[PDB]
Amino acid sequence: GSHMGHWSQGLKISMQDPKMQVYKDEQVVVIKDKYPKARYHWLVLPWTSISSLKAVAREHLELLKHMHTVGEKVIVDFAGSNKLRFRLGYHAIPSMSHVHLHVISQDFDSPCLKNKKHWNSFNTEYFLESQAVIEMVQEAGRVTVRDGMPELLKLPLRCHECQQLLPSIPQLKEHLRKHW
DNA sequence: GAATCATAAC
Ligand SMILES: Nc1ncnc2c1ncn2[C@@H]1O[C@H](COP(=O)(O)O)[C@@H](O)[C@H]1O
Ligand SMILES: [Zn+2]
């Protein structure tokens, strides 16, 4: 198939689709995640093309901080009165091209959350906090990731609120209901 | 039988 039509390039199409945009400014766009893994799941993307955090440098530090500020503003504007819990961060090894910040509510109540890989990509060290990425760029000038990130996606299922171990995705989804 | 694992997608 073509380069432009490859599945890994899909965010570059979605980020230009007005029906998926929830916020736009001179530097970034916010879209709904197409396969949301919680009740609220957005992606913040710069207009400028940066393939992944591997290509980030100090020239991008203001932009990474702006992406974080915009993510916080979207939470306030779209889900603020609910006083929900959110995390903002990056997957250590992404699958989709074009740098994107995940802004995700911590219920993880969604039919698109289907497997252990989904859970652990948001609930282990695989999920890099946005503030931690920002501080690494500021102090070290680039983002580095340690070996062993793919192995974390295989860790047994453990609740993020109470650390209980769960034997299956169905039982995990059932367990999460108690933390609403 | 249900759920996960491990692969494949030409
Ligand atoms: N075309 C798309 N538009 C919007 N979100 C997408 C699209 N394709 C995949 N996604 C989401 O993009 C994210 C890519 O994950 P990652 O590359 O691991 O950061 C996931 O949360 C997907 O659900
Ligand atoms: Zn729990």
Residue numbers in the entry: 161 to 340
Which passages does the manuscript contain on this structure?
The APTX RNA‐DNA deadenylase protects genome integrity and corrects abortive DNA ligation arising during ribonucleotide excision repair and base excision DNA repair, and APTX human mutations cause the neurodegenerative disorder ataxia with oculomotor ataxia 1 (AOA1). The aprataxin (APTX) RNA/DNA polynucleotide deadenylase directly reverses 5′‐AMP damage (Ahel et al, 2006; Harris et al, 2009; Reynolds et al, 2009; Tumbale et al, 2011, 2014) and associates with DNA repair scaffolds XRCC1 (Cherry et al, 2015) and XRCC4. Environmental and metabolic sources of DNA damage prompt “abortive ligation”, the failure of ligase to complete step 3, and generation of 5′‐adenylated (5′‐AMP) DNA strand breaks (Ahel et al, 2006; Andres et al, 2015; Schellenberg et al, 2015). AOA1 mutations map to the APTX catalytic domain (Barbot et al, 2001; Moreira et al, 2001; Shimazaki et al, 2002; Le Ber et al, 2003; Tranchant et al, 2003; Criscuolo et al, 2004, 2005; Ito et al, 2005; Mosesso et al, 2005; Baba et al, 2007; Yokoseki et al, 2011) and cause variable age of disease onset.
For five amenable variants (V263G, H201Q, S242N, R199H, and L248M), we successfully crystallized and determined X‐ray structures of mutant proteins as ternary complexes with RNA‐DNA and AMP. S242N: Ser242 maps to a surface loop linking α2 and β4. The native loop conformation is stabilized by a hydrogen bond between the Ser242 hydroxyl and Leu244 main‐chain peptide amide. However, in the structure of the S242N mutant the Asn242 side‐chain hydrogen bonds to Ser241 instead. These contacts stabilize rearrangements and an altered loop structure with a 1.3 Å shift at the Ser242‐Cα between the wild‐type and mutant structures. Overall impacts in protein folding are mild (ΔTm = 3.5°C), consistent with a surface loop destabilization of the structure. Thus, we hypothesize that by altering a common region of APTX these mutations may also affect a putative protein binding surface of currently unknown function.
